C-alpha cells in the first residue's frame, strides 16, 4: 500500500551489490511496502527510519512513500575479501 522510491545515491549503490543480493533485497522490500513501520526494525532515535537485513529506508506518511536511502554491507568490501584470502 506504500509507493517505493529510491534515493539516487542508493540506487547507484543498488546497481553495484551484485546479481544475488539486489533480488533477495527486492523481495524483502516489496514485502515492506505493505506495512513499512516495523518496530523491530526502527533505527534508534530515528522516528521514520527503518532497516532491512543492510538497507535503510525512510517512511514518508505524507506521500505514503517508502524512500530507500542507503543500501550496502556490514563491513568494507575489502574486509570480506581479506577474510576470504586469510582462510586460504
UniProtKB/Swiss-Prot annotation:
Q: What is its EC number?
A: 3.1.-.-
> What keywords appear on the UniProt entry?
Antibiotic resistance, Endonuclease, Hydrolase, Nuclease, Repressor, RNA-binding, rRNA-binding, Stress response, Toxin-antitoxin system, Transcription, Transcription regulation
Show the Pfam families listed in the entry.
Answer: ParE_toxin (PF05016)
Task: Give the GO biological process terms.
Answer: cellular response to amino acid starvation; mRNA catabolic process; negative regulation of translation; regulation of DNA-templated transcription; regulation of growth; response to antibiotic; single-species biofilm formation
Question: Which effects follow disruption of this gene?
Answer: Cells missing relBE have a higher steady-state level of translation during amino acid starvation than wild-type cells. They survive antibiotic treatment in log phase better than wild-type cells. Cells missing mazE-mazF survive hydroxyurea treatment better than wild-type; further disruption of relE-relB and tonB yields even better survival.
What outcome is documented for mutating residue 54 to A in this protein?
Reduces mRNA cleavage rate constant 2700000-fold
| GO cellular component terms attached to this protein's record | protein-DNA complex; toxin-antitoxin complex
Stated induction or repression of this protein's expression: By amino acid starvation, by glucose starvation and by chloramphenicol; induction is independent of ppGpp. Autorepressed by RelB, RelE acts as a corepressor. Member of the relBEF operon. Operon induced by ectopic expression of toxins HicA, HipA, MazF, MqsR and itself, but not by YafQ.
Keyword field contains Acyltransferase: no
Tell me, how does this one assemble? Forms an RelB(2)-RelE(2) heterotetramer. Also forms an RelB(2)-RelE heterotrimer. The RelB(2)-RelE complex is probably the one that binds DNA and represses transcription, possibly as 2 heterotrimers, 1 bound to each of 2 operators. RelE occupies the A site of the 70S ribosome, making extensive contacts with the 16S rRNA. Its presence blocks access of tRNAs and translation factors. RelB bound to RelE prevents RelE from entering the ribosomal A site and thus inhibits its endonuclease activity.
Q: Tell me the NCBIfam families matching this sequence.
A: RelE_StbE
Query: What function does the entry list?
Result: Toxic component of a type II toxin-antitoxin (TA) system. A sequence-specific, ribosome-dependent mRNA endoribonuclease that inhibits translation during amino acid starvation (the stringent response). In vitro acts by cleaving mRNA with high codon specificity in the ribosomal A site between positions 2 and 3. The stop codon UAG is cleaved at a fast rate while UAA and UGA are cleaved with intermediate and slow rates. In vitro mRNA cleavage can also occur in the ribosomal E site after peptide release from peptidyl-tRNA in the P site as well as on free 30S subunits. Seems to be a principal mediator of cell death in liquid media. Implicated in hydroxy radical-mediated cell death induced by hydroxyurea treatment.
Annotated protein name in UniProt? mRNA interferase toxin RelE
Please name the source species: Escherichia coli (strain K12)
Q: What is the lineage of its organism?
A: Bacteria, Pseudomonadati, Pseudomonadota, Gammaproteobacteria, Enterobacterales
Question: Which gene produces this protein?
Answer: relE
